[PDB]
């Protein structure tokens, strides 16, 4: 599946574009995603009432990093594959693929670029906490809950944050080397 | 959630189809297996396991639970692959052993399939939002029990993911019914 997708490529598209993606896949599938194992089973809360473990959880991780990492590889992945199959059904049977390609490194900045912005505006910043206080119902006035393994955890994600924004400047990069060949 | 010769099947299938049905349809199938595969099938890891009720009362607990999961998402969204796939698959293999009307029929169910899949997720969740606290009172639970969902906002998201991406494959599948309608 790489070699069909590796092909129809530039030096960097062929080649540094292709190696970050794998890279990150490694990263998030062999190491990371059994950091994220015990995320609820070790959140801990200094309180009695029934339910308000569960209310505290939900309000400060609305969504996993790691699921929002597997939506983001998916999303910027599908350009590409979807090239392949285009343009082979149009051979089937200069401008013309010029088009679907300048759109296709198109796409996967905007992906890329947006998905690290959902990650800075929702967990405030790139680093995690030990402790966050929750105030929901129906916990009582104010309660203390702790994170399970929190250093661990900013470790990956500032490793993932770096490797993306670097993917952000070999996309952008080709675009300009394209863009001046006119 | 491993594939042995996996790429084979799909490969097999992604031949002999129109403009549309060859990449769209394909594309959008398998987004929707990643996602219920790689993703959602650990949000509803611990739906039972996390399931808290404010009782002493042995077996609320099940009965709470039961009544208002009566089939969880993740085992909606698999029937609903395995029935939609199935037409496609019967086509490759009956085609193998008028091929308008087998072509044409096939993708008709198909519309039927996920129109009816939609359907029983509005009734019978009422609505695609999943809300924090439920109120049960079944036997034998005492009066009214208050009980508390795991992960409510999460399951939104993939709820509200898969139903945006069903209701495509919709269009997708009703304006090739009308090109094949046209060509007469």
Redo the contacts between chains.
């Keep these: 599946?790489l070699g069909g997708v590796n092909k129809h490529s530039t030096s960097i598209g062929k080649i540094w574009l292709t190696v970050l993606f794998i890279f990150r896949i490694m990263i998030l599938v062999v190491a990371a995603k059994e950091v994220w194992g015990d995320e609820?089973a070790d959140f801990v809360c200094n309180t009695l009432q029934?339910?308000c473990?569960?209310?505290c959880?939900?309000h400060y991780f609305?969504?996993?990093h790691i699921?929002l990492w597997?939506?983001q590889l998916?999303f910027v992945s599908?350009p590409a594959?979807?090239v392949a199959?285009?343009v082979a059904?149009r051979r089937h049977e200069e401008g013309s693929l010029w088009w679907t390609y300048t759109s296709s490194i198109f796409f996967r900045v905007i992906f890329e670029a947006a998905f690290m912005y959902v990650f800075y505006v929702m967990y405030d910043g790139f680093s995690m906490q030990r402790l966050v206080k929750c105030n929901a119902w129906?916990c009582p006035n104010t309660v203390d809950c702790f994170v399970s393994r929190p250093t661990e955890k900013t470790v990956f994600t500032v490793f993932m944050i770096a490797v993306s924004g670097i993917c952000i400047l070999l996309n952008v990069t080709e675009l300009c080397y394209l863009l001046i060949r006119y």
Excluded: C, E
């Design positions: 599946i609820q029934p339910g473990k569960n209310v959880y939900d609305p969504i996993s699921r597997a939506l998916i599908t594959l979807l199959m285009h059904y129906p």
